[PDB]
From a paper:
The fold of all the polyhedrins is highly similar – a β-barrel core sitting on a base domain, surrounded by a common array of five helices (H1–H5).
CPV19 possesses a combination of a long V1 and V2c hairpin. In CPV19, an extra V2c loop and elongated V1 eliminates the GTP space completely and displaces the ATP base ∼13 Å cf CPV1, to a site surrounded by V4 and V5. The V5 regions of CPV5, 15, 17 and 19 differ, but all end in a similar place. In CPV1, 14, 15, 17, 18 and 20 solvent molecules can move between these two voids, whereas in CPV4, 5 and 19 they are blocked by tyrosine residues. CPV1, CPV19 and CPV20 were resistant such that only a small portion was dissolved in an hour while the other six cypovirus types plus the two deletion mutants dissolved dramatically. In fact the three CPVs (CPV1, 19 and 20) most resistant to alkali buffers all display more extensive interactions between the 3-fold symmetry-related subunits of the trimeric building block – strengthened by either pyridine binding (CPV1 and CPV20) or numerous protein–protein hydrogen bonds.
Numbering used by the authors:
A (entry chain A), B (entry chain A), C (entry chain A): 2 to 248
The structure:
């Protein structure tokens, strides 16, 4: 028998670290991420990130999606009255006196991205009209469950070291498939392939105590490349550009 | 035996549809609705609608109830300092330098309406003072459960095709039975008359994933008739006018 | 045997009342309180109070912690563009064009206080950077559970009639132990020393229906003494001053 040298400890640790990071997403103590990216009429982006170690349920009213808004109030396009009149019309057919069909403050389109060990069967995304009645114009007809809004399979995955680790969905607020004047709701939970649910008797505490684990982050970027440079690549958030590059 | 004609298929389907809509409220995939309607000093209305397929728990601070506010910022009555001074006084007895006892921005009265297959025993509504201490002036004395706030039986139902389908409660913010300078909390869940709870081991997932199913809707209407015309009747939200008409 | 006088009924009732109030905190129908106190650059205080009969989970983004903000908008230090540029830099290293390293609107330091029959093992407090990635600069590396953030033992209790009834934690936003440009998350639940959990099959209803029992209260005080005079002592919220007096 012979021994005359060390194993490549440094290299072995590097492999372990690479796997540690690639596989961290499976830990219940890592995060799942949901980004709502709004492409505005000046080509600037408004980014809304939700995150949680376990579960994400979010909704955004029209005035939380337009720019400027009270979270990102860095432009001015309308006086108080003009904005009021506009909203009057977006809520109720012909009920407003606005001279504006659409607002300069309104998004042109969106990209929705979920990242982490997500339960794809839980990925749910619904753009309501301004009036915020689900799948209907009417309160009693309204329905909260529509297969169309379970968008998992319609999404396009983004790969990292050949692993699907994020999923992307995009659309236009041009009224053809999605409302022109949007209200947006979404949800996603982390995958659980085992029997013991994270909302069961013993795990529900942690879920509730961290239900508001992190505030939603709002960000405003000059244009998409700026966000790629200063956000997506920087923070390790997988992202798909207009020209369809996975960054 | 004889057969020589069709049954009235079209008519039978109409009955089925009428029942489908009248009875949709019993489906766990329909909505329950909670409206907080604020009648302002100019007779305009501020409407806040909460909705969820299962459960609604909401609270609103004073600055989310007055108008203007950061959600509906379409008037201006005060400078920054004036508003600060006012609030200073509303929070702490004689702790503010305002020259204003009451704000032009504050509501005169309210109407609270729950609609859907609601669990009336869950209907809870509490107007705290500005200082937001429940049923007390003191933190340790404060109590979260008071029978007075379980308002179900005090409400007046509104009927649709002879069925009680919404319930209304009203009051004045004149300090006599309700605080002049209000903070408002309410809750309501859908009725469950069967054994298997929607927060049990198997149903809790759906409850949590849709906890923020829909954003609260904020709306501002010229006066009550405008809202009747452009909102209540339009959206099939049952409503009771000042003159007590069920619309 | 002899009887010739009454017991001291009035006095006995007083003892019972004193105990009633001292012990109310153990009732599930009392409140637990969480105060985030921000000491600003002008020595004014911004107070954020969260409260709930059972459970508190909260997070605050940078723009909900600075002053002025959309909840307390009673000062003006920057134009829209200046503020945007500042935030650009706080989010992304060298990604902003601001001439300002720090904002006049940003807090110097904080005091976090939990009060009531709190589960000290549930007390969790985390100041993230502006970029809001937990315990990391990177999305996949991010971790939601760090012992450092379970601050219970690091806190200093405040006594009332010799009973520990509130706990205080303080720190500076000077970037040395806590980020200069903070995002803040915390949680705490009421103590449960018995077997039947308040999130179990029978108790989960009440927890959820009162999840948003009370809105967060925002308050702005001239300086610490003003808050002591008009808030802390007034409302029976235990508090520790700069000079370390328990009020
Ligand atoms: N199979 C083996 N058994 C014993 N020594 C071995 C063997 N293979 C290699 N060696 C090496 O041979 C060298 C001399 O070993 P040693 O003189 O103890 O052998 P041995 O006397 O034959 O073995 P043992 O101790 O089993 O009687 C040592 O450096 C040892 O590491
Ligand atoms: N009870 C009945 N039994 C059979 N046919 C009937 C009856 N009532 C009405 N009819 C009609 O009478 C017509 C002639 O029927 P058919 O000549 O097959 O009667 P049948 O020979 O008496 O009956 P079966 O086929 O039972 O021997 C058919 O159009 C049929 O629909
Ligand atoms: N141990 C006692 N038994 C009876 N009376 C008592 C006693 N101690 C004090 N007294 C008082 O003595 C007074 C007279 O009582 P009473 O004349 O009924 O006594 P008694 O006839 O000795 O007792 P009993 O009714 O048991 O035969 C009463 O005011 C009573 O309250």
């Amino acid at each position: 028998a012979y021994h005359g040298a060390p194993h490549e400890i440094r290299n072995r640790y590097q492999h372990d670290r690479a796997l540690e990071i690639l596989d961290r997403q499976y830990s219940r103590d890592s995060y799942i991420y949901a980004h709502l990216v709004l492409y505005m009429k000046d080509s600037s982006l408004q980014i809304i990130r939700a995150q949680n170690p376990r579960i994400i349920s979010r909704s955004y009213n029209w005035d939380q999606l337009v720019l400027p808004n009270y979270r990102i109030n860095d432009e001015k396009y309308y006086g108080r009255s003009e904005l009021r009149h506009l909203r009057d019309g977006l809520l109720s057919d012909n009920g407003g006196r606005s001279q504006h069909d659409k607002g300069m403050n309104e998004p042109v389109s969106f990209q929705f991205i979920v990242q982490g060990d997500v339960d794809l069967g839980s990925v749910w995304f619904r753009v309501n009209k301004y009036n915020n009645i689900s799948s209907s114009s009417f309160a009693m007809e309204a329905v909260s469950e529509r297969a169309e809004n379970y968008i998992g399979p319609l999404m396009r995955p983004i790969r990292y070291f050949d692993r699907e680790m994020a999923w992307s969905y995009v659309g236009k607020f041009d009224g053809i498939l999605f409302p022109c004047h949007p209200v947006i709701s979404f949800a996603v939970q982390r995958a659980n392939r085992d029997g013991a649910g994270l909302y069961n008797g013993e795990n529900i505490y942690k879920t509730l105590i961290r239900l508001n684990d992190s505030p939603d982050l709002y960000a405003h970027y000059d244009d998409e490349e700026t966000s790629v440079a200063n956000y997506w690549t920087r923070f390790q958030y997988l992202y798909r550009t207009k020209c369809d590059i996975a960054v």
